[PDB]
Design a protein around this ligand. Structure first.
Ligand SMILES: Cc1ccc(Nc2cncnc2)c(C(=O)Nc2cc(C)nn2-c2ccccc2)n1
Ligand SMILES: [Mg+2]
Ligand SMILES: [Zn+2]
Length: 313
């Protein structure tokens, strides 16, 4: 049990800031995760043998795609770690447990295509899960991995704690469906402004954990500008591949996905930040004030994209 994971000085200190980049050495990322779990959760909460075996099976089930890959999985888990460490006393044992696991698994087996594309293509996954298609698939992949031999990292929870944790995870993963985010943030904004928001109302915590999963998922926009700008090339690599594929079904795709409309990415990044990202981090900062660093970095990046449009870069 005294087998504590350690990090070099720069990473040890920078892992605590919201804007940490996990780096380009892929073989350090399992340890950055085990490090985050031990400090967030405790070192007795997972059997190290089972946790490492689970981590490796999860990484194996992330594909080689430009954005929705293993690096994204770990990067979303680091944002979650930073929210939990900045809000120590607000979450329970099972909640810290489930959520970091939910972040690592949340895009399991992503092929790099949206829900819209799966339904236009008439993929069999669209027949099985008529809404939040990929997200119900991600949760399914998580349960299968948890049921492999030697992978059940929750084995020592009681039947009731186990049911509670799977349920925290399923709801955390379903929430990453951005189609559900718009609704969820509006309701949190209405509860916040009327002062009815009650973190004892389980239905209310579920909404808050939802918004946290949006925040962690979009956190590439909260990075220092060189990291955000470079991650934007990976996201657009995927969008343009989907657009290519839309055109092979004979569907003209939305400007976001058309590689012939690269000129409009700067203006399209403004609307994304104004319609999705800025409100996300604003409402999250209203509910959890210590997550303010994410809104400040998200606004610095908007300014940077405004500066691109004015040809100052
Ligand atoms: C889900 C998601 C995650 C990350 C995203 N970007 C990103 C930027 N910088 C660094 N890392 C990542 C983007 C993104 O660029 N979105 C987007 C652009 C436009 C014109 N529209 N949208 C959009 C997409 C879905 C719903 C509403 C609007 N989307
Ligand atoms: Mg996803
Ligand atoms: Zn994601």
């Amino acid at each position: 049990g005294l087998m504590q994971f350690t990090l070099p000085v720069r990473l040890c200190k920078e892992i605590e800031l919201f804007h940490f980049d996990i780096g380009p050495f892929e073989n350090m990322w399992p340890g950055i995760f085990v490090y985050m779990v031990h400090r967030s959760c405790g070192t007795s909460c997972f059997e190290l043998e089972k946790l490492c075996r689970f981590i490796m099976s999860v990484k194996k089930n992330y594909r080689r795609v430009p954005y929705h890959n293993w690096k994204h999985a770990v990067t979303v888990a680091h944002c979650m770690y930073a929210i939990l460490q900045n809000n120590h006393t607000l979450f329970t044992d099972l909640e810290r447990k489930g959520l970091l696991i939910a972040c690592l698994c949340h895009d399991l087996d992503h092929r790099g295509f949206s829900n819209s594309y799966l339904q236009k293509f008439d993929h069999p996954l669209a027949a099985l899960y008529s809404t939040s298609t990929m997200e119900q698939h991600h949760f399914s992949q998580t349960v299968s991995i948890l049921q492999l031999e030697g992978h059940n990292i929750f084995s020592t929870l009681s039947s009731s704690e186990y049911e509670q944790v799977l349920e925290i995870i399923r709801k955390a993963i379903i929430a990453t469906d951005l189609a559900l985010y718009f609704g969820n943030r509006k309701q949190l904004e209405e509860m916040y402004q009327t002062g009815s928001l009650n973190l004892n109302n389980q239905s209310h915590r579920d909404r808050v954990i939802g918004l946290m999963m949006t925040a962690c998922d979009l956190c590439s926009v909260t990075k220092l500008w060189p990291v955000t700008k470079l991650t934007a090339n990976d996201i657009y690599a995927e969008f343009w591949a989907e657009g290519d594929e839309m055109k092979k079904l004979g569907i003209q795709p939305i400007p976001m996905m058309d590689r012939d409309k690269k000129d409009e990415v700067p203006q399209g990044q403004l609307g994304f930040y104004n319609a999705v990202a800025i409100p996300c981090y604003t409402t999250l900062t209203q509910i959890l004030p210590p997550t303010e660093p994410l809104l400040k970095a998200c606004r610095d990046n908007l300014s940077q994209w405004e500066k691109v449009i004015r040809g100052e870069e």
